[PDB]
């Protein structure tokens, strides 16, 4: 249960990290 | 037990990493 | 079920993170 | 057993990673 | 099963992520 | 067995990543 819960939080953080790195990538093109 | 505790620490570090990257994205724009 | 699902989403997010970092790496050379 | 130890090492590396991104975030501001 | 496949893709992505961050580290000196 | 092995490779990769991010932080100062 808790393991499942932590993993969706981990999953959600990685989605956010994924989004931010795409934006960083896009910006570094200039 | 320990696996759960490690996973909670992992989850928390990742929120911190997510936040810093938000700030970094904002600074580079 | 849910753990596998989260792990499957974690895997997809890291593929995206990997690709974005390649793009950033490419940009810093170029 | 081995699974827990890997997770505790994973936890510590993510803490190091979080701190470094804090540092990076500060410099880019 | 599915968990194992997911952990290996993750393991593989992190190797790539590691390589890219190394290239980034290298470029940022000059 | 395979789960344990994957987690150990995950742990080692996170160590490399931690090392890289340290180098990146220093150059950005």
Closest-CA distance of chain C to residue A19, Å? 8
The answer to whether the Cα torsion of E10, D10, C7, A23 is positive or negative is negative
**Cβ–Cβ < 8 Å for D11, B6:** yes
Q: Dig out the tokens for B7 from the structure.
A: 């996973």
Please give the span between the terminal C-alpha atoms of chain B, in angstroms, as a whole number.
Answer: 43
F7, F14, F24 member nearest D13 (Cβ)? F14
**B14:D14 CB<8 A:** yes
Reference B28, options D5, D7, D1, D28; nearest CA is D28
Q: Which residues of F1-29 are buried (b: 16+ CB within 10 A; e: fewer)?
A: eeeeebbbbbbbbbbbbbbbbebbbeeee
Burial of E27 (0-12, 13-18, 19+ CB in 10 A): middle
Domain boundaries, chain E: 1-30
């Amino acid at each position: 249960g808790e393991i499942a819960k932590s993993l969706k939080e981990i999953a959600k953080s990685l989605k956010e990290i994924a989004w931010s790195l795409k934006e960083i990538a896009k910006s570094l093109k200039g």
